[PDB]
Amino acid sequence: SGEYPTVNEIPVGEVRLYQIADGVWSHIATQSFDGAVYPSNGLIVRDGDELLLIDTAWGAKNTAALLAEIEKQIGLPVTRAVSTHFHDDRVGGVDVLRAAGVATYASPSTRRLAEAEGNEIPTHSLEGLSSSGDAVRFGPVELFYPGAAHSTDNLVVYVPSANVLYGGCAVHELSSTSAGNVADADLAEWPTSVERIQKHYPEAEVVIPGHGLPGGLDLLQHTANVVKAHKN
Ligand SMILES: C[C@H](Oc1ccc(CCN)cc1)c1cccc2c(-c3ccc(CS(C)(=O)=O)c(Cl)c3)c(C(=O)O)[nH]c12
Numbered sequence: 711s712g713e714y715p716t717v718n719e720i721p722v723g724e725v726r727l728y729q730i731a732d733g734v735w736s737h738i739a740t741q742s743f744d745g746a747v748y749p750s751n752g753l754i755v756r757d758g759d760e761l762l763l764i765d766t767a768w769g770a771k772n773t774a775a776l777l778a779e780i781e782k783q784i785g786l787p788v789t790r791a792v793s794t795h796f797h798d799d800r801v802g803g804v805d806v807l808r809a810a811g812v813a814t815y816a817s818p819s820t821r822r823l824a825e826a827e828g829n830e831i832p833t834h835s836l837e838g839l840s841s842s843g844d845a846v847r848f849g850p851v852e853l854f855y856p857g858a859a860h861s862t863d864n865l866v867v868y869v870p871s872a873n874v875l876y877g878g879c880a881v882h883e884l885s886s887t888s889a890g891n892v893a894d895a896d897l898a899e900w901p902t903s904v905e906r907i908q909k910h911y912p913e914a915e916v917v918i919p920g921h922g923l924p925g926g927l928d929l930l931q932h933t934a935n936v937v938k939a940h941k942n
């Protein structure tokens with residue numbers, strides 16, 4: 711009823727949307743992994759009379775449900791999707807998207823890592839993102855590579871019309887007590903990568919983490935703090 715939806719509020723297989731700003735929604739789904747249930751976020755950005763999707767809903771059936779929820783709530787076609795790193799919460803569902811008319815994109819680094827690890831592989835490569843600090847425009851967003859953090863390939867997304875920063879899994883929510891799944895992370899570089907985000911997007915008004923509740927710019931400093939203490 712208007713609050714940001716939480717993990718025990720979303721059965722696995724259902725998707726909810728949350729209006730962030732004019733023409734900007736997050737999507738929230740839940741998935742089981744290694745016997746625990748987790749929420750995850752993605753983004754939807756209006757692109758004229760089309761939609762740009764950022765990240766899958768963490769699985770084929772969740773992603774089909776996402777497309778149905780978009781049709782119900784928004785009613786514009788998703789024409790393109792960008793996956794912000796190679797993990798299943800970002801690319802699991804790319805095959806569903808590709809069969810539903812959506813052109814799927816990721817950096818070459820993400821595509822190589824997805825292929826090597828046996829995850830679904832976006833079709834199109836996003837060049838111009840291979841060096842930390844790189845930025846490219848993609849429809850109504852800017853894509854930014856901050857450097858290694860949660861993963862070596864992680865991208866963040868800015869919506870300039872709304873000053874919305876989608877941090878993906880490089881950014882944690884304010885209640886986080888650890889740095890999440892750090893198996894592919896660079897804990898030593900992660901604070902430097904967060905500092906790059908802070909420097910590049912100082913006017914962000916909403917910051918959306920990969921998992922959990924949006925907030926403001928404090929999510930960036932909190933993330934740096936938890937990662938440094940995790941490493942400690
Ligand atoms: C989708 C992801 O798959 C994998 C990630 C890495 C590997 C290693 C080999 N390639 C394999 C699978 C995955 C699976 C299951 C969980 C996660 C979490 C997560 C997020 C928040 C919290 C709460 S918190 C900040 O307080 O710790 C926690 Cl515990 C975990 C994250 C993330 O951090 O982005 N990714 C998750």
Ligand SMILES: [Zn+2]
Nearest residue numbers: 795797860879
């Ligand atoms: Zn991840």
Ligand SMILES: [Zn+2]
Nearest residue numbers: 799879920921
């Ligand atoms: Zn994640």
